[PDB]
């Protein structure tokens, strides 16, 4: 097995052994460890509380040297999530001379990170709509100019994810 396969099996074992609260993640099929499905719950007492949000994680051949791609498959409305579902946060951006508008030498991906860490960071991102990427310009603007409406939309996003 290549380095990538080794690391990914190792990470998954730790996840199955000690399941993280509010986060479920693993390969859709163990014949291909490079494609995972993840489910994360919006943290209690935040505007996305109890939403259940599915995402696909696609890992590069050179993992963990490069980060996975992560895309939500459900409807979302958040400053750091593109209209297509792609999650844009500094920790998922490969170190490189192209800020892609993140931050002052924003914290990039490193092999120190892990799937558990990416997912916990995304959970935090939901709880703390931290406009670092302006991925959804409309959500960015509303978070800034009409917070109370943003909260309204967020509960709708929750209800939709629950199928209610």
């Amino acid at each position: 097995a290549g380095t990538a396969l080794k690391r990914l099996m190792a990470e998954y074992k730790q996840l199955t052994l000690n399941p993280p609260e509010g986060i479920v993640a693993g390969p859709m099929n163990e014949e291909n460890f490079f494609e995972w499905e993840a489910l994360i719950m919006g943290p209690e007492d935040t505007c996305f509380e109890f939403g259940v949000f599915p995402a696909i994680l696609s890992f590069p051949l050179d993992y963990p040297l490069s980060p996975p791609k992560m895309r939500f498959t459900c409807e979302m409305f958040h400053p750091n999530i593109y209209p297509d579902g792609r999650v844009c946060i500094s920790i998922l951006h490969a170190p490189g001379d192209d800020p892609m508008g993140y931050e002052s030498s924003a914290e990039r991906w490193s092999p120190v990170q892990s799937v558990e860490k990416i997912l916990l960071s995304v959970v935090s991102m939901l709880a703390e709509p931290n406009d670092e990427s302006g991925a959804n310009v409309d959500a960015s603007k509303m978070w800034r100019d009409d917070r109370e409406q943003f909260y309204k939309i967020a509960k709708q996003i929750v209800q939709k994810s629950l199928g209610l």
């Binding site: 199955t16 509010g22 693993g26 163990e30 929750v158 209800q159 209610l164």
Partner: peptide, 28 residues
């Protein structure tokens, strides 16, 4: 565990996550 065991547990954790979230949302 086997892969089959792991895959089944995963599907189960996912169903249960959604069921408990729904309960907490409706309970609130």
């Amino acid at each position: 565990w086997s892969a089959d065991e792991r895959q089944r547990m995963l599907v189960q954790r996912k169903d249960e996550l959604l069921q408990q979230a729904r309960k907490r949302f409706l309970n609130k």
